[PDB]
């Protein structure tokens, strides 16, 4: 029968795969053209397209190929098969398209590749290749898309490559490739997409790169490239993506960049960039993601960023920045996530951040922010993660937080917040973390407090608290509680044995009195307990020594009296019980009886 | 956030039918905002408390890379598999509680390398093999419970093991010693 048939059959049998893969290929005249994955040219019966991928198919690739001569398409993807790449495939030659991606091929890349020549698309992405990039591929003039990434390719990027006039798309990303990026690259005029990152390059970005007009996607990230950001780059007017993040770039960000009006995503993160942000950055109305994270960046943030109709992700964190946040910020209503933390930012939080209720992650922390906390912020449905710690935020805390079905993480610690703690706080259904510590409150906890449906960590420590500690009513999810350093009086609740999951409880430096409830002897996982510096008087509970989980009990500086438990308590530190003048036992030194 | 990647390795190898690990988010700047993880003021992990999480499956040796890890509490779970010798790679570890699980295999001699160690509880597991002598070089050791296992061997009475009553080593396969009931060769 036909060489097409000998070919397809030999291909069937030479590739070891689950029989599900080749299920329809058996032969009884032009039969093979029916088969699954096969497409034939309706006049000639010759197999012009072969797609077999994600077939879980491994093996050797037959030498009885090139028997289907007019074949324009070959796709084999994800199938794990390793080898030196077959040089046999280069002798196909009517191929316009070849995808060998996501497979295991290794060692070097065989030289004969230029023999294809009418070739448009080559995808080698995600394989085990080592060795220098084949220089040879540089000679297919018509090559449009080339993906060599996802391998380990040694050596530099052949400058020869700049000569594929028709090349649209180039992916060398995630290899071992190195050195200076060859300037000749600015000569692919038709070039749209360039992703070369995750290899190791040094030097600058070649000024000559400003010559690619049609360029859209440019990602050089996770390399060693350095020096200044070239002014000239401000001239690629078609550019929708620029990722320069994690490199050695220095000096100010050139004002010229205010010129990419098509720019959408910009990520400069983990560089040395210095000086202020271009006043002209206010002008990119196609801008969606803006990330300056972790640089030397300075000066105020341009007021003009207040309205970019499209702004979504804003990351300014880890610089030294100054002044107000742009005050109409968030009013574009599409704002999702903002992190400005670790800066010198001052002033008031924008009232309109959530004006569109699309915002979820808000990190304002470690800043100079002053003034009250936007009431509007309790109106944000989407709010899930919010961390405001280490600021000057003042006055009473806004009262609407318990509404939100999505809100799981809140840190208000170290601020100037005064007055009451919001009551609805423990009514909010998902809230898993709450830190109100180190504030100016001068009021007391809610009755609601221990009722929190899923709430694991809670810290009110060192904010000017006063009053009785509300009885724990169905303590559910709590593992860590810090109430220490306050003016709280009254007694430790009868029902505290309700928190089964409780681990570390720091109650110290307070005005507490009465006794220490036996119920704690029965907390099943309990680890750390710090009760020191109080008016507590009573006995240390009988059965406590029977617990395999307590490593810490600090009852020091109290009125306690009576014997200390022989138990786990034997392994304890004497200085835990010191300045309790009424205790007897071994660890206090004075015997009973 | 190296240790973040490590904790996440553990997570990934882990079966978490109730999603406690669900807060463990590899893309976070470090795992100090994770639940069940506790870090210091230097932002390195000193604690991992997963006790009673209904976790199944196993552990990865990546747990070694937490250099400042002090308390590792995995007790009362369905965790099975072996015990990684790379736990010897944890120096500042004060407490190791693996007890109440399905763990199999030897007790790693590398465990003899933890000199800040105070509490060691492997009890109520499936462990086999002998009791490594290097364990006796930890003089900070206070509570050792090896009880309820498959352990074969002879029990050390020297070093820290001076202080240990039989309730520590009770109910095993052949185990011989003066720390126990039945002597040996």
């Amino acid at each position: 029968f036909s060489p097409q048939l000998l070919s397809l059959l030999s291909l069937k049998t030479s590739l070891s795969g689950p029989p599900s893969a080749f299920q329809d290929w058996k032969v009884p005249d032009a039969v093979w053209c029916s088969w699954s994955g096969v497409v034939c040219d309706n006049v000639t019966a010759q197999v012009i397209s072969l797609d077999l991928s994600h077939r879980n198919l491994s093996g050797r690739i037959p030498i009885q190929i090139r028997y289907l001569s007019s074949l324009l398409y070959l796709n084999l993807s994800g199938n794990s098969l390793e080898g030196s790449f077959p040089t046999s495939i280069f002798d196909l030659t009517k191929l316009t398209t070849l995808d060998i991606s996501r497979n295991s091929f290794d060692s070097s890349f065989p030289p004969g590749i230029s023999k294809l020549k009418f070739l448009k698309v080559f995808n080698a992405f995600s394989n085990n290749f080592e060795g220098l990039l084949p220089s040879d591929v540089s000679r297919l003039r018509f090559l449009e898309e080339l993906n060599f990434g996802g391998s380990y390719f040694e050596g530099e990027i052949p400058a020869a490559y700049g000569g594929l006039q028709r090349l649209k798309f180039i992916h060398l990303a995630g290899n071992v490739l190195g050195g200076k990026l060859p300037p000749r690259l600015g000569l692919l005029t038709e070039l749209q997409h360039m992703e070369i990152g995750y290899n190791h390059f040094n030097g600058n970005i070649p000024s000559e790169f400003a010559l690619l007009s049609n360029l859209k996607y440019f990602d050089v990230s996770n390399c060693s490239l350095s020096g200044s950001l070239p002014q000239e780059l401000g001239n690629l007017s078609n550019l929708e993506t620029l990722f320069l993040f994690q490199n050695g770039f220095t000096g100010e960000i050139p004002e010229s960049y205010s010129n990419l009006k098509s720019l959408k995503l910009l990520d400069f993160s983990s560089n040395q960039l210095s000086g202020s942000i271009p006043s002209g950055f206010s002008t990119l109305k196609n801008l969606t993601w803006l990330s300056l994270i972790s640089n030397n960046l300075s000066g105020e943030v341009p007021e003009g960023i207040g309205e970019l109709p499209e702004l979504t992700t804003l990351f300014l964190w880890n610089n030294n920045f100054t002044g107000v946040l742009p005050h109409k910020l968030g009013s574009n209503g599409k704002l999702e996530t903002m992190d400005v933390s670790n800066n010198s930012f001052t002033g008031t939080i924008p009232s309109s951040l959530c004006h569109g209720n699309k915002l979820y992650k808000l990190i304002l922390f470690s800043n100079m922010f002053e003034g009250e906390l936007p009431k509007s912020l309790t109106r944000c449905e989407s709010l899930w993660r919010f961390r405001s710690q280490n600021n000057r935020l003042n006055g009473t805390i806004p009262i609407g937080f318990g509404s939100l079905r999505n809100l799981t993480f809140v840190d208000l610690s170290n601020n100037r917040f005064t007055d009451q703690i919001p009551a609805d706080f423990a009514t909010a259904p998902v809230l898993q973390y709450l830190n109100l510590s180190t504030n100016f409150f001068h009021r007391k906890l809610p009755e609601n407090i221990w009722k929190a449906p899923n709430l694991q960590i809670f810290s009110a420590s060192f904010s000017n608290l006063i009053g009785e500690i509300p009885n724990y009513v169905g303590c559910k999810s709590f593992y860590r509680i810090e109430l220490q350093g306050n003016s709280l009086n009254g007694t430790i609740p009868w029902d505290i044995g309700h928190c089964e999951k409780l681990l570390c409880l720091n109650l110290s430096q307070n005005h507490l009195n009465g006794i220490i409830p036996w119920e704690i002897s029965t907390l099943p996982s309990i680890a750390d307990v710090d009760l020191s510096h109080n008016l507590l008087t009573g006995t240390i509970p009988s059965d406590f020594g029977s617990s395999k989980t307590i490593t810490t009990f600090n009852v020091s500086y109290n009125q306690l009296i009576g014997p200390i438990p022989s138990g786990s308590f034997a392994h304890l530190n004497p200085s835990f019980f010191s300045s309790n003048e009424g205790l007897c036992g071994d660890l206090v030194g004075k015997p009973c009886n | 956030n190296m240790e973040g990647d490590a904790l996440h390795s553990l997570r990934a190898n882990l079966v978490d039918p109730n999603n406690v690990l669900q807060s463990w988010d590899p893309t976070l700047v470090n795992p100090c905002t994770w639940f069940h993880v506790t870090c210091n003021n230097e932002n390195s992990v000193i604690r991992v408390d997963l006790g009673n999480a209904d976790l199944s499956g196993q552990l990865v040796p990546q747990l070694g890379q937490l250099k400042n890890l002090q308390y590792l509490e995995l007790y009362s779970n369905n965790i099975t598999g072996p015990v990684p010798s790379d736990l010897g790679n944890l120096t500042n570890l004060v407490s190791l509680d693996l007890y109440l699980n399905s763990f199999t295999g030897p007790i790693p001699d590398s465990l003899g390398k933890l000199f800040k160690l105070r509490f060691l509880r492997l009890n109520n597991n499936s462990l086999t093999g002998p009791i490594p002598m290097s364990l006796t070089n930890i003089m900070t050791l206070q509570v050792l419970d090896l009880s309820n296992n498959r352990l074969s061997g002879s029990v050390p009475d020297n070093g820290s093991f001076s202080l240990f009553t039989p309730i520590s080593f009770a109910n095993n396969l052949d185990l011989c010693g003066p720390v126990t009931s039945r002597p040996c060769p």
Binding site: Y152, Y198 | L28
Partner: peptide
């Protein structure tokens, strides 16, 4: 071998 792609993710 698979390779990262996109904007830098790291977060707080």
């Amino acid at each position: 071998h698979e390779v990262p792609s996109g904007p830098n993710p790291i977060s707080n």
